[PDB]
Design an enzyme around this catalytic site. Structure first.
Site: not given
Lengths: 823, 823
Positions: B363, B554, B560, B662
């Site tokens: 991932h 998030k 991010k 996702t």
């Protein structure tokens, strides 16, 4: 909104809509199916089915006392010996052979399933097994009784005869779960420990405390066939699960993790004096319980109802705490602590209610074994309580001084605080001070808590002393255990007997009748074939059935005399051998109970019994002329199927040592002749049955008290009684054991030189008596004769009776025999 | 045996027959009534009621696979972010309606009860969330699949922002139990820690270990209306503790009751570094499951087509293992240790099978993050696993040498041992050697694992590398969360879509149907107002359900940009404040995300928002034209509630950091427009959508590499962009903290002097996007026109498709959408 009622949940008496319930739970509860489900799965499936058919009733009983508001009478005890619920749910509810048809129409066998059940291990012997019985009979007598104690993950060990010895191999009864109980996360309260006091304007604080969470579990105990089903509520310790760090307490070092185990294992082991844990345990069970006792007195109905600021003026009207033994005693210092400190009741007003609410059942004939605690043990875990105990005391002792001016040696014989080489608190005195009523367990015994042990206490408050001669219970100890014999009674007298009991007195007229004589030796010959079957199935033996069936199942412990037995059964092995044709009645003798770790004389005495075994049953000279079986792991499921093949109940303890005796009543019921030294409860059983119906040998209370006043010396008998000279010799010259000859050498010197229990002094009288038992065995029917006149006698040695007594003179509350409707 | 049938209980669709069992579960299964029972007992009586529906179908499916005997696929993941059963258990099985009707009539609002369920803290983030959707779609796609995780007694924390700072808080979700989980104590197996590898005969033994018992807990995972229910087997780490006399260990010293604790907390907690705890948890899951897989391989049906070894020859055909991330990784030496040591197959028969059998999903996109563990740690708790990584590593390097003869550095880059300071093993290279396929979780991220991250490896086994881009499930994340958006979409195209999401593309013909355009807008408007009510109820402040709902949710991390959003937010804040009279399209920014304990800049950036919202949600000058909300404790529960109520989806990750998304695919689907950088996830989501219907902005990856050559110097943008220079000084003087100015100083200093994530590089163009946003939103007709266009093209993101390709291309098994009957 009112449509969530107890309506429809089962079809009771129906083989088929409970055959829909054995299916329901196997699938939806147990998540198992017929290709994968195990015996233990179908017992858990059956267990659940009779259980919805219990908790239906339990809702409405419970409903009833909110409406009706009885005096709720909580019985406090750290031992609760139930031991196999399934069958006993079935009979007191009815569903037994209506559960037998479903579970064979299903294709199983409800008796094979029944034996998958581990004993609900909350006990060790008669302090748990008495209350376990009083819980059945309070439930039947209409009474609002609650039983509260601790839920032990392991109970007390499982025994294991290996190499002749006992291996205490632990009992994880609860690993596969337990059908019968419900957990209650929602009503968890804390137990505070250690800390310190800190007084203020109006009272005192007990701050700085360590805490252990109290989580409740509900087993129910049904009342016999009148639909009221009550709550046992047993506590479990949860360490505060704030842990990993919260408080930032572990920060600089984790090792408070040692709290987690030393707190949480409050709940894992029951004991078999000098222990923070036995006291921690003790304070645990009383704190949680009494917090719950106060929430039904307020919240459940007085939540709202006051008059007197919901004061405790009406507390003693509504509540009654019955301390079984000294282990609940902190119920007086804790009750005083909550009323005074937490509410704010006057010391005087609060102590008003305290005594009025409490009372205490006494079990010891000995003053030396009577719970007392070290003040350094109190003062550190329990400060406020070491302080309230100090204050109750001069208050009490000035009341003593009012009634005895100038009599100084009593203010130290009454005292709460023992002195000298460790100042201790005498817990039984604490109880008598805050209990409005103390009772002896047997008649005799209440006299010797007047005449000898609480003499001063009876002189000053003469009336607290009551007596309640503790019984057994028909349901358990006739109906489950000996149904062939509860079969041949029923129709003669009327089934009114199981809940109204000296009616057993009628079968007396029925003695003579040579129908009843042949009738009964069938129950006893069938029983002695079934139990002589079970013997060889689980574990194995080679037996007679027909034999004299001789049994003594007690604790292995010096003052109950397994030893007296062993000497005799070596007279028997030896005389029958001497003249090898010397006919005598062939007996199978069964000795059994667990011992107690760190007890070598009670480890030794198992080993002498498992040294004999070998040389008797394997000296085929004897053949089947003599057999001694040891019952490994004797507990309540074995209790209900050896009293069953009781010809002989050998309750042979030194006179005036037993405070009473419970496993002797549920022996002159099943049809057993009780041969034994008189004291305890071997007495009233003969004052009922007639001494001529009993077989009382040997010494008595009174000439035992004589003996250690002009020297007692067992040898003298060594030099006289020629066969005891024999068996002492053979005991000592490695007869039993060629491999370790010496071995019973620590028991010889015990038996000889410092026998506190006069085993040798009650020898001879015992054998010219068990000759009266053997020679009468082989008079095969006027044997069968007396075995009825004992049964008829019964109703006093029934715990229904005893509960009516406690009910009536100590609690208040009037009994009942009425059937609550529905289920 | 036949009478005990499933045949049922399931009156199913029937209100009466289930108001009837909501009554049984309340009275007979939970033992409560309307007078004691609270909300928790009612939801639990509902919760229990539906899972009799659930477990009948469970039984039935499990049976089926025993009969048919399909290839079974086990999916190991350390987090299963399950989150809230009941509403989904009822929609996947149809009872939303009947359960509503039964509890309608009962007096119970079925919405209320749902919100008593505790989110199962069996997960943490995205890595946990895809498994959960990979189990819903493994079950709707008829695959014989299992989920193997850890039954975390408490889980990773509860966010609890107090006064502004993220407080960590524990999660005992299972306080009052779990209705959904069924503990299988029968299947307890041991997990062997530490030990010695003694060598002998045809093999090696691992002697002297320490057993921890892995105890299994089953949860059903139902498929949308197809009658299958698969399993999820979670392992509880229960310490072997017979630590009370046994082994001659305790007494001597209970110093060692720590193998209680460090056995026991392999499952008390979930994580947020070199911890033997993390590796102990990683091997525990592997030991308990591979021994359970072969338990099921040996037992269901195969040891009779035993022609050869209940052969492991056929093991890859009946089995498939998925290793989600390098955490199940020790499963390639454990499925080698059993097959070699125990079963005794050939080493190359254990590899032929270990490589054909298991497969690795990766991932990551940033390499440092690939897992490594020190051989000191492995030489100790895993002696023999180290030796299987040492013979693997050696034989793989032969394969490598012959493939690239002479390339000495390829042997050092393709290795599994890896050293410098601390000789670590590389677990990701372990997985590629032991797996038949390796896969990326997104298109371009799967290229840059053969382009860059495992490229040498790739060239030597090119045939292993596949891709499979992530997907949401249509049931939790469109049906459950948004049944409003669900009626309208189904009214037109039908209901076949829930099981096949590409039919949302059919809705693309209704773009210009202004009934549907006013309809979807309606839908999103109650969503924004059932949610806006969540707030002044649980939490508060002031909402304005008209505004442009701008959420970024998030987790809190520097890469991010929660910070970029903070700065855009006070730029709007300031434009609203210098020029109050300008019309501005008002917005409610909602920022939520669980920081991560230990990490301080995540700690610190949450305090930014909890100080920007205090300053601007109290400015009666802006009034309501802006509001800033930190959403406390993001979980599967509030995603349900949040993605549903939002307009803009804020996906501002720095380009080159994300692999696949996702979280995006849930907002895209529930009609929200992405604003976001072109980066891993946002890239297939814009191939489909058309760039038009996206707010693509700023810096691209080689734009990031252009500046990562010439060098970042934030200061050049500070003295080239006046609106930035503007708020650096808002921050620095301490606007947002009048009592502690210098509080956000290290943020200001990070931002300028060492921002590895390029906040200021993207600033100006991200703003020139926020306000084009504000153009279209203030054009509701054309906003919805673009939102139609989103929801229709999003079908590619069903895990039904991400699974339809693993199954097909990797596991072998082929998708099926048929029913079973299952009473």
């Amino acid at each position: 909104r009112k449509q969530i009622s107890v309506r429809g949940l089962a079809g009771v008496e129906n083989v088929t809509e409970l055959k829909k319930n054995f299916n329901r739970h196997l699938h939806f509860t147990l998540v198992k199916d017929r290709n994968v489900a195990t015996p233990r799965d179908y017992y858990f499936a059956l267990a659940h089915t009779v259980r919805d058919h219990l908790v239906g009733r339990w809702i409405r009983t419970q409903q009833h006392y909110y409406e009706k508001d009885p005096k709720r009478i909580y019985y406090l005890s750290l031992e609760f010996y139930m031991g196999r619920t399934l069958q006993n749910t079935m009979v007191n509810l009815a569903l037994e052979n209506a559960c037998d048809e479903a579970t064979y129409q299903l294709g199983l066998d409800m008796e094979e399933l029944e034996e998958i059940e581990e004993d609900a291990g909350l006990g060790n012997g008669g302090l748990g097994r008495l209350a376990a019985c009083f819980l059945d009979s309070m439930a039947t007598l209409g009474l609002a009784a609650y039983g509260y104690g601790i839920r032990y993950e392991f109970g007390i060990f499982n025994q294991k005869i290996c190499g002749g010895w006992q291996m205490e191999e632990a009992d994880d009864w609860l690993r596969y779960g337990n059908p019968w109980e419900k957990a209650r996360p929602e009503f968890t309260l804390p137990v505070h420990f250690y800390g310190r006091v800190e007084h203020t304007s109006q009272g005192a604080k007990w701050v700085d405390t360590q805490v252990v969470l109290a989580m409740p579990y509900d087993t129910p105990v049904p009342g016999y066939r009148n639909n009221v089903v009550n709550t046992m509520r047993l506590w479990s310790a949860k360490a505060p699960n704030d842990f990993n760090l919260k408080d930032f307490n572990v920060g600089g070092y984790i090792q408070a993790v040692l709290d987690r185990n030393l707190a949480e294992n409050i709940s894992r082991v029951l004991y078999p004096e000098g222990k923070e844990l036995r006291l921690k345990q003790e304070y645990f069970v009383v704190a949680a319980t009494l917090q719950d006792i106060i929430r039904r007195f307020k919240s459940s109905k007085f939540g709202c109802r006051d008059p007197v600021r919901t004061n405790f003026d009406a507390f003693p009207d509504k509540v009654a705490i019955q301390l079984n033994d000294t282990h609940p005693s902190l119920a007086i210092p804790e009750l005083m602590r909550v009323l005074v400190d937490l509410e704010r009741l006057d010391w005087d007003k609060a102590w008003e209610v305290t005594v009025k609410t409490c009372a205490y059942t006494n079990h010891t004939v000995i003053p030396e074994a009577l719970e007392r605690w070290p003040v350094h043990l109190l003062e550190t875990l329990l400060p406020r309580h070491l302080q309230i105990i100090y204050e109750i005391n001069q208050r009490f002792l000035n009341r003593v001084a009012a009634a005895f001016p100038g009599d100084v040696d009593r203010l130290r014989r009454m005292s709460l605080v023992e002195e000298g080489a460790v100042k201790r608190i005498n817990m039984a005195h604490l109880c008598i001070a805050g209990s409005h009523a103390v009772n002896g367990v047997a008649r005799i015994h209440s006299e010797i808590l007047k005449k000898t042990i609480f003499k001063d206490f009876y002189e000053l408050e003469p009336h607290k002393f009551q007596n309640k001669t503790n019984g057994i219970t028909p349901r358990r100890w006739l109906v489950l255990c000996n149904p062939g014999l509860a079969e041949i009674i029923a129709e003669r007298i009327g089934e009114e007997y199981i809940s109204d009991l000296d009616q057993l007195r009628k079968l007396l007229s029925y003695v003579d009748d040579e129908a009843f004589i042949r009738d009964v030796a069938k129950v006893k010959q069938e029983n002695k074939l079934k139990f002589a079957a079970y013997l060889e199935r689980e574990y194995k033996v080679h037996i007679n059935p027909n034999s004299l069936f001789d049994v003594q199942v007690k604790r292995i412990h010096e003052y109950k005399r397994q030893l007296l037995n062993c000497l005799h059964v070596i007279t028997l092995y030896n005389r029958i051998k001497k003249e090898p044709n010397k006919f005598v009645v062939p007996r199978t003798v069964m000795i059994g109970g667990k011992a107690a770790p760190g007890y070598h004389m009670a480890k030794m005495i198992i080993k002498l019994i498992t040294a004999i075994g070998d040389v008797v049953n394997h000296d085929p000279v004897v053949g089947d002329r003599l057999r001694v079986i040891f019952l490994e792991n004797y507990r309540v499921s074995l209790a209900e199927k050896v009293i069953p093949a009781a010809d002989l109940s050998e309750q042979i303890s030194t006179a005036g040592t037993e405070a009473s005796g419970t496993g002797n009543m549920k022996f002159m019921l099943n049809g057993a002749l009780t041969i034994g030294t008189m004291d305890g409860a071997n007495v009233e059983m003969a004052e009922e049955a007639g001494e001529e119906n009993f077989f009382i040998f040997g010494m008595r209370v009174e000439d035992v008290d004589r003996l250690d006043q002009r020297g007692y010396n067992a040898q003298e008998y060594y030099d006289r009684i020629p066969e005891l000279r024999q068996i002492i010799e053979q005991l000592s010259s490695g007869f039993f054991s060629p491999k370790q000859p010496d071995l019973f050498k620590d028991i010889v010197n015990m038996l000889m030189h410092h026998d506190r229990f006069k085993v040798f002094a009650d020898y001879e009288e015992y054998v010219k008596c068990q000759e009266r038992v053997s020679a009468l065995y082989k008079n095969p029917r006027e044997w069968t004769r007396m075995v009825i006149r004992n049964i008829a006698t019964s109703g006093k040695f029934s715990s229904d009776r005893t509960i009516a007594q406690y009910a009536r003179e100590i609690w208040g509350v009037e009994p009942s025999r009425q059937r609550l409707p529905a289920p």
